[PDB]
Write a protein that binds this ligand. Structure first.
Ligand SMILES: Nc1nc2c(ncn2[C@@H]2O[C@H](COP(=O)(O)OP(=O)(O)O)[C@@H](O)[C@H]2O)c(=O)[nH]1
Ligand SMILES: [Zn+2]
Ligand SMILES: [Zn+2]
Lengths: 103, 139, 96, 729, 88, 170
């Protein structure tokens, strides 16, 4: 029951999946939310894309690393206009300096 | 009350934090007991039909056993001791976050924090055993 | 089925309706005026909720939904000290 | 950054007031603006210089004050349309208040904390009752303010309009249900405070005027029905109004008032004209119109005091009907028709209690407590009726009855016989009367089957119990067991050490002497021919040692093989001209002084002068030829007779019942004083009834005779007189 | 002979007989019932033995007596319930 | 001064705690000693060449739990849980006395010697193997004693002192 996080530019998705699930099933589940055909869309592990044949177990993740407290982040890119675009993670805002509590 | 004790219970804790149990006698005054190290278990006896309360040793937080607040021993069945497992309750963010603030903030330095006025009273409201058992008398 | 949350910066978060329904403020916002559901119950905008704190709240919602009434062990929820005050303020505002 | 800020409160409230007014009365509001107003309320409650929760609450309270009065003027201005106008505004306000509570969710939490601190200080100081304690939620405050509109003189108008409009049951105007239900439900919907009674307002403002008005209306309606409708058609009118009342109250009234309105309806048309209904109570029961009797029961079920009246009337009809059939059957000398009459009355009336009375075990009690008196009549002094007739009924279905044969039907008829057996009270009389009659059957072996009567003891196994059937179980076992001893000697007679036939053709039915009711040894007698008893004496000595504890006493009461007290022929002659007592001679040692007339009369049918035969002479006999019948031949010389005749003899058996009844009178007390050492005058009475009502009837008339016996057999003086003195020690 | 024969023949003879224990023990003292039947007295001493034969056995006085009816006698009284006492 | 050892004799009432105590110090058997007397007795003895004073507390009275008796029991350095071999109930109660000693001393390792008294009687109901196994499960020595004949009375007390000494060198 690994919990993932799909982030594109500013959009963030909170979903859950099983290790027996596949990248094709993940694409199917994000299709119903993003209203985009799943053939073009592709996923990333911040280093290389994930093939459809490979299942969720063999690409890493696992329950120990992927927990509800600290879910893993999975990139996503669109492949519509015949040209790939660089992964724009766009990280969240930096937290402010900590108050007097630093001791 | 005074009754025979043909029963024994096992105190096994699953929570990461240290557990300090307090047991209610016939008088009703819970007393401190040696702390249970995390991820351990001890074989112990008990009065039949007497409440047990499990609390944190350090900051006195709430702990749940058998998905219940109170623990009542029962008569032994076919030579099998009864097992009690302690789990961390599902704290709310307001309650969970105050625990982080309370540990970090010196108890005489609340007023220097720049937060809302209402949260000052809640932050100063340290958990207390007499308060805890007051909300269990009803029903 | 899926609600939409928007932070002050502009980040967009999509979580399950049941996951987001554990907060009284969000429940009241969703169950307010007359409902048509064609373009309603979505894009819930929070004007003073930063992106990191909103993400932490979403992680709460997922953890609480998953770990409710569970007989297994309950690991503690980790809270960063630098985000503690803002997260506490957001929890107080949202009535978690 | 949710840190406290500075707010002028003179601009956010003005913007918020427009949104709040749109939320009320269900006006369109932008979805984006709805979410934005949540932050404005939060900002006001955390203002940096000082919290503005008090200012926000007071301003919101003022707005609801003016809005309610604005709607109040419009409703009061319009006349004849108050109900329709009130319903339209109430629905908009009811939904608007709920939405405002969600918007003011944050402010509600602050009120709860503030209220709890002051709620703990009310005992020490009221402070004007906590300065008119703020409502826990803003939505609850809105309902309170709408209540003041109800408190306004609109309450008098709304009640008057509602009562008049609901009073259209006379006609068929059919007022709209939605307006009625919405207005009535508003009385209870406004009150949702659980500290007080939620229905307290509704009962005081609407239930009390409605109940009084409903009762008065049906008081006039009940009177008008009597002047035209007869008692028979009055019931049909009652059923229709009661059925329509439930439908009418279902649509318009709150569920909590369903039973109360029906109870008031029943107490007016019924239990106020109960004298009129009771007048026809006797007529309908005597008549066969079962359809109208159903309407009697339905109305009278609700009223508690009405049922006892019809208990007695039904009992009287059963009592009179049973006596007429039983009394007309007298002098018919037929016992099998008595059981048929009782079962027919029970069979016909048990259907009536079911199909047109719907159970009512209380009414079923009337059948049981009335039919029991029919069985024991006792008024005519003839054949004692109930004890003897029941006893003389089972034998006809269990004896030979060659002419009357109904195979596979006696089992059914005997099972149906139990419907009258438990209604009798003199069960002791029946028990011993049946025992003596039963014992006469197996001895002569005229029962039609050996397994047929097995059902009888089984039928009495549970009705009478083991204590009653402890003796009766011994009748069956002996006859079955006696089939084992006779052939045991047959095997033993073939295994004699001396190997001598002895010329024995013998059979024995061993009795019990503890349960067999036949009398034994009325006199000495014990006269037995010598040439026959010698073989029988060998039987006695060679059988006793087999058990080694029993010495059977030989009797000749029911000897056969009937050939009772055989003359042994001899070779002497006498004279017999007329009557009897012709100087009887050569009489051996029998004790037959008073038994001459009973025994000598056996042969007068066959032989008189004792001068015939005596032709052939031989050492033993000639046996030349047989020709006509021989051996048992005619057999028609029996003198045991049927029913034993002798109208004096069975009187001792009934006296023996009284003697046995007297045994229990001084013996049932043993258990009474064994547990209750200290006795009270009322305690002894009915104590025997509580334990022996089924066995016999412990009437107080004969109880006075029992206590006389208790006076004797005691020597401890009874000093006190507070209770009964018949207790020993 | 008008209607008859020499006769003088012997046929089978059957009848009924009554058996007894031959020792009445004068109906004991208080039970005054048949010795075969269960005695009322056996509800107090509670000596469960020979349920078939409640009273017919050897007595305490080395003589034919009730098994338990006379057992209570030693506890309370001294007279002999067998001789010179009838009815009462 | 010379070394003192505070040892405590506990057990069920009637097992012989007083008889064993009197026999050790006064060298005679006293039967039916008053069961309600609880007192401390002292004797100077030599064990293994070392002279020491024994402070023997002979316990008695009703069961009672408070700070005063807990502190009074806490002073004990060694404990003698004595049972009667002809009293099965006394042997069954042995476990109950052991736990409380562990609570008041706040340790699982307390010098303690199991004593089976009344060995001279022929009505034994607890076999030797039963007591040896219980003592072995507790990691303690077991001694059979008879205050009437003084058999093993000195052995029981001397072993407990050795148990205290072996505890202190750890
Ligand atoms: N035979 C025998 N009897 C003993 C022995 N020790 C004690 N008793 C008996 O046990 C009884 C009570 O013993 P006591 O010392 O008063 O019990 P305690 O003080 O409560 O432990 C006395 O009457 C003794 O006769 C023993 O070693 N042998
Ligand atoms: Zn007797
Ligand atoms: Zn008996």
């Amino acid at each position: 029951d690994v919990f993932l996080m799909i982030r594109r530019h500013k959009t963030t998705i909170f979903t859950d999946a099983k290790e027996s699930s596949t990248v094709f099933e993940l694409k199917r589940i994000v299709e119903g939310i993003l209203k985009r055909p799943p053939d073009e869309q592709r996923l990333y592990k911040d280093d290389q894309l994930l093939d459809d044949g490979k299942t969720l177990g063999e690409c890493g993740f696992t329950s120990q690393t992927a927990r509800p407290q600290a879910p893993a982040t999975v990139g996503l890119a669109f492949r519509a206009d015949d040209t790939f675009e660089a992964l724009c993670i766009e990280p969240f805002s930096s937290p402010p300096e900590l108050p007097d509590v630093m001791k | 009350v005074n009754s025979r004790e043909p029963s024994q219970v096992i105190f096994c804790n699953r929570s990461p934090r240290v557990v300090l149990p307090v047991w209610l006698n016939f008088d009703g005054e819970p007393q401190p007991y040696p702390t249970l190290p995390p991820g351990t278990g001890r074989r112990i006896h008990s009065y039949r039909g007497h409440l047990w309360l499990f609390r944190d040793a350090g900051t006195h937080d709430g702990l749940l056993v058998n998905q219940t607040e109170l623990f009542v021993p029962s008569l032994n069945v076919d030579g099998q001791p009864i097992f009690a497992n302690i789990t961390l309750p599902v704290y709310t963010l307001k309650e969970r976050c105050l625990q982080v603030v309370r540990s970090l903030v010196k108890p005489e330095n609340y007023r220097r924090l720049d937060i809302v006025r209402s949260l000052y009273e809640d932050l100063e409201d340290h958990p207390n055993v007499q308060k805890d058992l007051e909300r269990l008398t009803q029903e | 089925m899926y609600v939409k949350l928007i932070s002050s910066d502009g980040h967009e978060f999509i979580v399950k309706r049941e996951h987001a329904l554990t907060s009284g403020t969000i429940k009241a916002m969703l169950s307010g005026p007359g409902q048509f559901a064609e373009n309603e119950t979505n894009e819930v905008n929070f004007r003073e909720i930063p992106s990191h704190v909103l993400s932490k709240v979403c992680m709460y919602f997922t953890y609480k939904v998953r770990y409710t009434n569970s007989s297994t062990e309950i690991p503690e929820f980790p809270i960063a000290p630098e985000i503690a005050l803002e997260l506490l303020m957001a929890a107080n505002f949202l009535d978690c | 950054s949710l840190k406290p800020r500075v707010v002028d409160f003179d601009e956010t409230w003005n913007k918020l007031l427009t949104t709040i007014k749109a939320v009320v009365m269900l006006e369109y509001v932008e979805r984006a603006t709805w979410n934005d107003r949540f932050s404005d309320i939060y900002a006001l409650c955390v203002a940096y210089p000082e919290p503005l929760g008090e200012r926000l609450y007071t301003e919101t309270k003022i707005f609801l004050e003016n809005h309610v009065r604005h709607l109040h003027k419009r409703v009061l201005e319009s006349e004849e349309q108050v109900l329709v106008m009130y319903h339209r505004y109430w629905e908009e306000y009811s939904k608007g208040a709920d939405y405002m509570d969600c918007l003011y969710r944050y402010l509600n939490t602050q009120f709860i904390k503030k209220n709890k601190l002051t709620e703990a200080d009310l005992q020490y100081g009221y402070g004007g009752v906590d300065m008119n304690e703020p409502l826990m939620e803003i939505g609850e405050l809105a309902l309170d303010m709408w209540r003041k509109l109800m408190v306004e003189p609109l309450q008098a108008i709304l009640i008057r309009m509602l009562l008049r409009e609901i009073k259209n049951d006379r006609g068929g105007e059919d007022p709209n249900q939605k307006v009625i239900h919405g207005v009535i439900n508003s009385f209870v919907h406004v009150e949702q405070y659980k500290k007080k009674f939620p229905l307290k307002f509704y009962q005081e403002i609407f239930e009390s005027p409605f109940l009084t008005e409903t009762g008065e209306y049906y008081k006039q309606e009940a009177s008008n029905l009597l002047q035209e409708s007869n008692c028979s058609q009055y019931m049909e009118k009652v059923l229709g109004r009661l059925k329509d009342e439930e439908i009418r109250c279902r649509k318009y009234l709150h569920p909590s008032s369903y039973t109360k309105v029906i109870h008031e309806c029943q107490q007016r048309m019924v239990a106020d004209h109960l004298q009129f209904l009771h007048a026809e109570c006797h007529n309908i029961i005597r008549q066969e119109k079962k359809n109208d009797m159903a309407n009697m029961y339905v109305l009278l079920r609700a009223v508690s005091t009405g049922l006892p009246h019809m208990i007695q009337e039904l009992q009287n009809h059963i009592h009179d009907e049973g006596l007429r059939a039983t009394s007309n059957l007298t002098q018919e000398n037929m016992p099998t028709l008595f059981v048929e009459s009782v079962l027919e009355v029970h069979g016909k009336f048990v259907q009536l209690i079911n199909t047109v009375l719907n159970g009512d075990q209380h009414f079923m009690s009337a059948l049981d407590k009335a039919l029991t008196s029919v069985v024991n009549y006792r008024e005519p002094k003839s054949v004692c009726k109930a004890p003897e007739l029941l006893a003389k009924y089972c034998d006809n279905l269990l004896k030979k009855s060659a002419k009357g044969m109904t195979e596979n039907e006696v089992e059914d008829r005997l099972t149906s016989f139990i419907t009258v057996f438990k209604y009798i009270d003199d069960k002791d009389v029946f028990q011993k009367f049946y025992a003596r009659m039963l014992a006469k059957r197996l001895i002569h072996g005229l029962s039609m089957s050996m397994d047929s009567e097995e059902a009888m003891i089984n039928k009495l196994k549970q009705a009478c119990g083991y204590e009653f059937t402890s003796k009766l179980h011994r009748m069956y076992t002996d006859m079955s067991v006696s089939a084992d001893l006779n052939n045991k000697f047959n095997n033993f007679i073939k295994n004699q050490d001396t190997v001598i036939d002895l010329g024995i053709s013998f059979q024995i039915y061993v009795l019990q002497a503890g349960a067999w009711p036949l009398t034994q040894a009325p006199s000495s007698t014990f006269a037995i021919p010598q040439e026959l008893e010698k073989s029988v004496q060998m039987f006695e000595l060679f059988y006793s040692q087999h058990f080694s504890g029993r010495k059977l006493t030989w009797l000749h009461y029911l000897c056969t093989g009937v050939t009772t007290y055989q003359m042994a022929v001899l070779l002497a002659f006498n004279n017999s001209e007329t009557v009897s007592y012709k100087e009887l001679q050569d009489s051996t040692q029998m004790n037959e002084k008073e038994l001459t007339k009973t025994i000598k009369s056996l042969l007068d049918v066959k032989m008189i002068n004792h001068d015939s035969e005596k032709e052939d002479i031989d050492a033993e006999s000639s046996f030349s030829l047989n020709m006509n019948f021989s051996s048992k031949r005619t057999k028609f010389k029996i003198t045991t007779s049927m029913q034993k005749d002798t109208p004096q003899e069975m009187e001792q058996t009934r006296s023996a019942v009284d003697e046995d009844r007297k045994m229990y009178l001084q013996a049932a007390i043993v258990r009474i004083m064994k547990a209750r050492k200290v006795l009270r005058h009322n305690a002894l009475i009915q104590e025997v009834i509580s334990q022996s009502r089924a066995r016999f009837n412990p009437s107080i008339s004969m109880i006075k005779k029992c206590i006389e016996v208790l006076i004797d057999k005691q020597y401890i003086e009874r000093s006190q007189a507070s209770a009964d003195e018949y207790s020993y020690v | 002979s008008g209607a008859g024969k020499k006769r003088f023949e012997v046929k089978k003879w059957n009848a009924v007989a009554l058996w007894a224990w031959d020792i009445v023990v004068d109906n004991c003292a208080i039970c005054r019932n048949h010795i075969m039947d269960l005695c009322i007295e056996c509800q107090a001493n509670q000596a469960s033995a020979t349920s078939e034969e409640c009273t017919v056995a050897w007595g305490v006085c080395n003589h034919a007596f009730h098994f338990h009816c006379i057992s209570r006698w030693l506890k309370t009284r001294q007279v002999c319930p067998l001789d010179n006492r009838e009815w009462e | 001064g010379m070394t003192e050892y505070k040892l405590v004799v506990v057990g069920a009432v009637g097992v012989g705690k007083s008889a064993l105590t009197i026999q050790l110090i006064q060298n005679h058997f006293v039967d039916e000693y008053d069961p309600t007397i609880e007192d401390s007795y002292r004797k100077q003895v030599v064990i293994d060449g070392e002279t020491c004073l024994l402070d023997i507390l002979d316990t008695a009275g009703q069961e009672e739990y408070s700070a005063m008796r807990d502190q009074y029991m806490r002073t004990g350095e060694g404990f003698l849980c004595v049972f009667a071999i002809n009293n099965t109930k006394s042997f069954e109660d042995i476990h109950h006395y052991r736990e409380q000693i562990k609570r008041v001393k706040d340790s699982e390792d307390v010098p303690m010697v199991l004593v089976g008294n009344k060995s001279d009687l022929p009505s034994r109901t607890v076999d030797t193997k039963q007591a040896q196994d219980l003592a072995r499960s507790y990691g303690i020595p077991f001694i059979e004693t008879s205050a009437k004949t003084r058999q093993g009375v000195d052995d029981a007390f001397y072993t407990l002192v050795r148990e205290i000494r072996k505890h202190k060198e750890k």
